[PDB]
Amino acid sequence: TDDKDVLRDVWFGRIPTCFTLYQDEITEREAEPYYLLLPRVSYLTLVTDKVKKHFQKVMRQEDISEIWFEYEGTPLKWHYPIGLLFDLLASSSALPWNITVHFKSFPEKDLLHCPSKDAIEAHFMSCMKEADALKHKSQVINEMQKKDHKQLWMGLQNDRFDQFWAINRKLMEYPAEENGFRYIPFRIYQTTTERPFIQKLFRPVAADGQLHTLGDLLKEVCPSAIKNQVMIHGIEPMLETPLQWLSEHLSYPDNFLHISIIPQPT
Amino acid sequence: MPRWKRHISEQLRRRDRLQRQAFEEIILQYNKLL
Amino acid sequence: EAADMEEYEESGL
Amino acid sequence: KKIDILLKAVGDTPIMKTKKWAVERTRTIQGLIDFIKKFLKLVASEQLFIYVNQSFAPSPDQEVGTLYECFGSDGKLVLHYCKSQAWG
Ligand code: NA
């Protein structure tokens, strides 16, 4: 379907990235840059194993520590999806995305550690559980067997679209009596604000059954966006786009609509 | 097909053309020789 | 009736 | 301006003598966690988990105010704490 094509286009979204080793990192020799197509829907610490291996090779063994990344001085939070970080921070700059690789001086004030793959899974499932609490009072996610939870995770970590959506489609359903989710899982990000993001309760269907739009959402929770562009998965949807449809088709695998508000470029 | 949906599909394809398609071969070729 | 956390932290653990 | 939070122990985790607290909306889950640990005279090496809706564990950088506005009810946010995982 046209809808299914959108799901695949979202899922397989890629950002061309140039990983360069921090110029002041202490090394035995100079490291070449490493180029990679990064998946928008995933997390840095899940897909940069080859980057890590590449740059560890020039480090003294004792100087190897937890790897971290920054964009022009801004540490990159691994628990934020890759596409969101790029949209928010670098989408106005020329490609490829220039990420600087670090080992020394992990900035604990700006970043959460990622001590294991399990921490990534725990984070991912926690996001999905939060999303379903909003959408179904957790009824769908809790009715699932643990093997289904695993399948969702494996589909993300191994880039298996059909494997993931065989389960995720259930999380995109809603009661027959209804015409949408209870509340839409969304977060609105804006660099100029102090708060990390805006997240509020917003119902996707009006009392008369009509579908609320992206424009309606913004008027309610972020009037200061209507000079600024609204970016989701690197594109700018029309404000008349129904929110329920967006939630179903343009959410990340964590079932959240991550929305960036960014200055209009020139 | 509603205009808002057409718009989204078109913009995703353009995004993919400019961001992925334009870089995939040179990035692969770079890694090949790296 | 809720205890003020900011009060306790600044009072003495 | 501050929000009311109620803390409930899961399983054999120690019980806080004082459970109802008023906290700044900008306080994070980690800030909340650090307070409980030294309130229960626990230690850093000991990990402590926090749960919303008896369902999910929010990221430790999440702010309580947002959680309250989304998952609060009857004027307060209920959070469960546990020395071990409870809900995955
Ligand atoms: Na660049």
Side-chain angles (χ1 to χ4, degrees):
Chain A
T1 53
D2 295 318
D3 285 343
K4 187 177 182 181
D5 288 336
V6 172
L7 300 183
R8 292 184 56 88
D9 284 346
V10 170
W11 179 271
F12 292 104
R14 290 291 188 275
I15 294 167
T17 304
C18 181
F19 289 93
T20 301
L21 186 60
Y22 180 49
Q23 58 201 353
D24 297 317
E25 194 79 48
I26 299 170
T27 66
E28 297 295 74
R29 58 179 168 86
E30 193 179 336
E32 308 115 315
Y34 197 97
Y35 285 96
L36 191 54
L37 285 173
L38 284 184
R40 281 180 168 274
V41 304
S42 197
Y43 305 89
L44 283 167
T45 47
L46 199 57
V47 301
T48 53
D49 294 342
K50 288 178 176 169
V51 174
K52 187 195 289 186
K53 186 184 186 181
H54 177 74
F55 287 114
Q56 281 184 355
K57 282 176 62 178
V58 311
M59 303 297 291
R60 292 197 313 171
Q61 189 172 16
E62 60 265 54
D63 294 345
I64 296 171
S65 61
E66 183 177 3
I67 194 168
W68 60 283
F69 307 103
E70 47 105 342
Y71 174 70
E72 296 187 1
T74 297
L76 302 179
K77 304 181 208 69
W78 63 265
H79 61 291
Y80 277 41
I82 289 167
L84 173 61
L85 293 168
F86 175 77
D87 280 6
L88 191 60
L89 300 174
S91 61
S92 80
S93 288
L95 295 169
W97 187 13
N98 291 111
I99 294 180
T100 301
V101 180
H102 288 260
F103 292 109
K104 199 176 190 308
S105 304
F106 191 97
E108 286 177 356
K109 184 68 199 68
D110 298 321
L111 301 182
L112 301 174
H113 287 282
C114 193
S116 74
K117 196 169 81 170
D118 180 88
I120 307 175
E121 179 179 5
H123 174 69
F124 180 70
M125 293 309 302
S126 178
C127 291
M128 287 195 89
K129 284 175 175 182
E130 184 173 352
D132 204 58
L134 296 167
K135 289 195 290 180
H136 301 110
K137 302 186 186 179
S138 318
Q139 295 180 358
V140 179
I141 196 84
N142 289 339
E143 176 167 3
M144 282 181 180
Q145 297 178 238
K146 268 197 72 175
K147 75 187 290 291
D148 298 336
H149 290 174
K150 195 187 178 182
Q151 184 167 341
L152 285 164
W153 163 249
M154 301 305 293
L156 177 70
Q157 79 136 38
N158 294 336
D159 196 11
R160 309 301 304 269
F161 175 86
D162 286 336
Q163 174 178 37
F164 180 81
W165 273 99
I167 308 300
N168 202 50
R169 62 185 178 88
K170 298 290 175 64
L171 296 166
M172 294 306 179
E173 289 169 0
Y174 50 83
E177 293 176 320
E178 304 295 341
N179 299 272
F181 303 140
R182 192 189 185 210
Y183 296 116
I184 298 301
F186 76 92
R187 286 173 184 169
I188 294 170
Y189 303 82
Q190 204 172 358
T191 59
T192 44
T193 66
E194 290 180 356
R195 57 193 169 280
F197 56 81
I198 296 170
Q199 183 183 340
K200 281 180 159 60
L201 298 178
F202 190 87
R203 298 180 181 270
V205 187
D208 58 7
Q210 294 186 68
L211 301 172
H212 288 140
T213 64
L214 175 59
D216 297 325
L217 172 61
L218 296 172
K219 285 203 197 67
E220 178 60 25
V221 309
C222 189
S224 300
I226 309 162
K227 207 167 187 188
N228 278 342
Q229 65 183 152
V230 184
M231 183 171 286
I232 307 174
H233 289 289
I235 62 157
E236 185 165 0
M238 300 180 67
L239 295 177
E240 73 186 30
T241 305
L243 187 62
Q244 176 65 29
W245 185 93
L246 277 171
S247 183
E248 291 171 6
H249 299 87
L250 255 69
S251 283
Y252 284 70
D254 64 7
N255 280 225
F256 264 86
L257 266 175
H258 299 290
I259 307 173
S260 286
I261 310 302
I262 64 178
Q264 187 68 32
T266 64
Chain B
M1 186 176 189
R3 183 143 160 264
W4 58 261
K5 189 187 279 207
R6 175 189 161 191
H7 178 76
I8 281 171
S9 297
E10 285 174 353
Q11 292 298 130
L12 283 168
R13 287 200 303 272
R14 178 176 176 272
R15 179 201 70 176
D16 290 2
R17 264 193 49 255
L18 296 174
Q19 300 191 338
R20 183 173 71 219
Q21 189 181 337
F23 283 94
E24 61 186 10
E25 275 170 34
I26 186 169
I27 288 179
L28 182 57
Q29 181 67 212
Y30 181 86
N31 274 273
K32 204 227 303 184
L33 306 185
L34 184 58
Chain C
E1 294 299 320
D4 187 274
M5 182 173 294
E6 205 159 25
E7 184 184 333
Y8 278 57
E9 266 185 343
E10 289 170 6
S11 67
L13 285 307
Chain D
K1 181 57 172 173
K2 294 174 177 182
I3 63 168
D4 292 341
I5 289 179
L6 176 57
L7 305 165
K8 303 183 182 182
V10 172
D12 69 331
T13 298
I15 321 303
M16 294 174 66
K17 261 289 161 185
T18 307
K19 297 176 175 58
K20 203 170 194 285
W21 300 88
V23 307
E24 290 283 14
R25 292 173 115 85
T26 55
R27 182 174 289 263
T28 62
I29 291 295
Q30 188 61 54
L32 186 62
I33 285 167
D34 294 337
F35 176 83
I36 297 168
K37 283 189 171 182
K38 62 191 168 179
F39 185 95
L40 294 180
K41 297 182 168 189
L42 298 177
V43 177
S45 64
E46 296 178 320
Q47 52 178 353
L48 185 70
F49 300 92
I50 298 293
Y51 292 93
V52 175
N53 276 19
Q54 306 185 69
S55 176
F56 73 91
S59 188
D61 55 345
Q62 205 152 347
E63 295 184 348
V64 297
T66 302
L67 292 171
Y68 171 89
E69 292 291 351
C70 288
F71 306 105
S73 76
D74 301 315
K76 59 189 171 64
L77 174 61
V78 178
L79 300 169
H80 289 261
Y81 59 93
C82 198
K83 288 187 175 171
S84 69
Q85 186 192 287
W87 301 283

